[PDB]
Every structure is written in C-alpha cells, then in structure tokens.
Design a protein around this nucleic acid. Structure first.
Ligand SMILES: Nc1nc2c(ncn2[C@H]2C[C@H](O)[C@@H](COP(=O)(O)OP(=O)(O)OP(=O)(O)O)O2)c(=O)[nH]1
Ligand SMILES: [Ca+2]
Ligand SMILES: [Ca+2]
Ligand SMILES: [Ca+2]
Length: 341
DNA sequence: GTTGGATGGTAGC
DNA sequence: CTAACGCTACCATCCAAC
C-alpha cells in the first residue's frame, strides 16, 4: 500500500499570479473583506513573498495593510479558484481511481496498485507535478509514504514546490524524532497538555500509560496517537461526502434587533439552498457569532427533509431561541444544513 | 444502560 | 464603522427517550 498526497502551493495566491503574472515576484495578499468598514475582515492566504513579513492566513486585513502597505490586496474569488481546483482534481483521476479529495487544494491517492516501490512512486509524483504545471501553471507539493498521515507529513516537510518520500525506515525515525505538535490532528491546546505530561515526541506517548492520557486529550486522540507511535495505525482512502452546507454573514453593525438581523439571515438561507443543489437536508442550525466572538448556536432536526419555506420559518424561531438565552449583541449570523437524504 | 440530539471544543482549510 | 472571514469535519459532554 503506497499513499501519495498532493497539496497545491500558496493556492489562491498562486492562482492569482497565474491570472496576473505582473504580480509574480511581488507580495500578494488574498482578502476576505466583510463590508463592515473599509478593510474589515481577514486574510485567506498570501504568497511566500508576503509571508516572509508575517502576513499569514488568518490575521486581520488591517494588520497586513499596516505591515505591507505597498502590496497587492485582492478580493477572494472562491468560485474562480474552485474551477482551477476542479480541473486539477480531474487530472489526478488519470493517475488513480482511489482518490480522496480532502480540501480545495489537497487530495490523497492510493497509487499502491499503479507502482511497486517508493522509487516508482517518486517518479510518479514527478510526472504528476509536471502534468499540473504544463496544464494549469500551478506548482504543487507531493508527499509520499505508506499511509495518509505520514504522506501529509512528508509534504508539510517539502513545501513549497517539493516532493518527498518517507519510507518505512524514515518512518521508524520520525516516531522517535518528529516534534509532537507537527502531527496532523494536533492544535496548540492539545500541543500544550502534551508538554504537560512529557510527550514531546510522537513516541513519548508510549512512556506514559493509557488512561490519564485520554483523560487529558480524549479517546479518539489516544487511539489515534498511540497507534502511530506503535506504527500499527492505518487509515484508508475513501471518497468523501459533504455532510454539511453553510453560509454566514457579518452584519454592518452589531445588534439584538430581530428585525435588523432578519434580512442578513435570509441571505444565508437563500445562498445555502443554492449551495445545496438537490440535497434535501433534515436538519438546520442557526449559528450566530457574538460581540466577544464566542460562537453560539441552536438547531432543530426534522424526521423529514426541509423545504426552503420551512427553514425560513424555523430559523426565525431558532434565532429567537438564541436571543432568549444569550443576552449579548450578535455580530455575525448565518445558517447551516446537515443530515441529507 | 445504549442511541440520538442538542450545543460546543478543537483542528485545518 | 474603528481587530478577529468564512467554511467544514470530527469528538466530548450532557440529558431524554427508550
Ligand atoms: N478564508 C480562508 N481561506 C483559507 C484559510 N486557510 C486556507 N485558506 C484557503 C487559502 C489557501 O490557499 C487554501 C489552502 O490552505 P493552505 O493551508 O494550503 O494555505 P496555502 O496553500 O495557500 O499555503 P501553501 O500551499 O501551503 O504553501 O485555502 C483560512 O483560514 N481562511
Ligand atoms: Ca493543505
Ligand atoms: Ca496548500
Ligand atoms: Ca500543530
């Protein structure tokens, strides 16, 4: 079983250079404006020229404009990007029919049946790299290893424009040496209790017991981490099916005025039912984000699929239900559908 | 003495 | 208006219905 993995490089940004090569070699920042006020909102992504200064995805657009006044600030075009993804995802079907679209820029492959050893695998990722580059002008990063995790890890090591094989032997090696907070599945919070026990190596896990660990990080995590440490771990490729569909909007000013929030909410519902396209959901959750940016929500689940009209009326209740229990002014509000038939 | 649902915690794009 | 998008997936916890 050989698992190759691909993660496109500074994606949305790289796409924009493709369209506007006069940007090439000059820091670019891809923005999710929010119409609150001029330059309100956050950064989706930015290229490596920009990242050198500290402008990562996440940071507020006003921080970036502080840091990089003379850069190119661009409004995110998810739809344009989704196209370059889609196409690039169809190429990858030429190489393997066992393909698991992870994100918009990431897909795993099972090439195990297409090649025989990591050397032939290497050669594939190399052609795969050239395939995409010739047809879409996008550099990517290929990460190869025996299973999904380490593949995603082997790429995260090669980024950008890299290609990296992690073979059985190098795998023994990382379990011992790889810094725990670099494992896919580990955020800062979990990466913070891990030092609290002593587990800094992906293998350290094995020097602690079984329980207290889980009593600190949870059941799935213990049975995730320990398996990798004991290298028994193996996660299979499957085609992923979208389980939820949302839309959420920031309001021009914070409110508790139901007649003020309503039109914003009805926006989300409309654009949701389009983003649905034929999927009939049985569950709705109205999610609002509050002033202190704590995100809070209320949902309902129907024994049957919901019509557009149903969710119009049901969402209102839910918003009321939210107004009943949190007395804080709402800042962003949207809706979320799940449990499709 | 589970199964699911309602809310939220964490982690990654 | 005065900083913090928008999106998805998965697990942990808690309380009722069975
Ligand atoms: N709105 C928004 N978009 C994001 C966020 N994180 C990532 N994206 C978008 C922009 C990225 O190009 C794309 C994939 O995320 P990545 O982790 O791959 O960042 P990126 O690929 O641009 O860096 P790069 O490929 O790794 O060297 O999705 C985020 O927090 N918010
Ligand atoms: Ca990625
Ligand atoms: Ca990427
Ligand atoms: Ca981490």
């Amino acid at each position: 079983g050989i698992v190759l993995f691909v993660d496109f490089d500074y994606f949305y940004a790289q796409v924009e250079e493709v369209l506007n090569p006069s940007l090439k070699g000059k820091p670019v920042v891809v923005c999710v404006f929010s119409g609150r006020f001029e330059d309100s909102g956050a950064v989706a992504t930015a290229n490596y020229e920009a990242r050198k200064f500290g402008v990562k995805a996440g940071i507020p657009i006003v921080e970036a404009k502080k840091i990089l006044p003379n850069a190119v600030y661009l409004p995110m075009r998810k739809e344009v990007y989704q196209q370059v993804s889609s196409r690039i995802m169809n190429l990858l079907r030429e190489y393997s029919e066992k393909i698991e679209i992870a994100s918009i820029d990431e897909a795993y492959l099972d090439i195990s049946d297409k090649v025989r050893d990591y050397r032939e695998a290497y050669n594939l990722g190399l052609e795969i790299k050239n395939k995409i580059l010739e047809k879409e002008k996008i550099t990517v990063t290929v990460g190869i290893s025996k299973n999904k995790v380490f593949a995603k890890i082997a790429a995260d090591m090669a980024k950008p424009n890299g290609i990296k094989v992690i073979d059985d032997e190098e795998v023994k090696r990382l379990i011992r040496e790889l810094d725990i907070a670099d494992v896919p599945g580990i955020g800062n919070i979990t990466a913070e209790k891990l030092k609290k026990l002593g587990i800094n190596k992906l293998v350290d896990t094995l020097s602690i017991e079984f329980d207290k660990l889980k009593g600190m990080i949870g059941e799935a995590k213990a049975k995730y981490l320990i398996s990798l440490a004991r290298d028994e771990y193996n996660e299979p490729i499957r085609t992923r099916v979208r389980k939820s569909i949302g839309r959420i909007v920031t309001m021009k000013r914070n409110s508790r005025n139901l007649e003020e929030i309503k039109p914003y909410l009805f926006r989300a519902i409309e654009e949701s039912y389009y983003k649905l396209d034929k999927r009939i959901p049985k569950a709705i959750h109205v999610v609002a984000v509050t002033e202190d940016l704590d995100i809070v929500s209320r949902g309902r689940t129907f024994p049957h699929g919901i019509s557009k009209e149903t969710a119009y009326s049901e969402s209102v209740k839910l918003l009321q239900k939210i107004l009943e229990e949190d007395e804080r002014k709402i800042r962003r509000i949207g809706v979320r559908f799940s449990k499709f038939i």
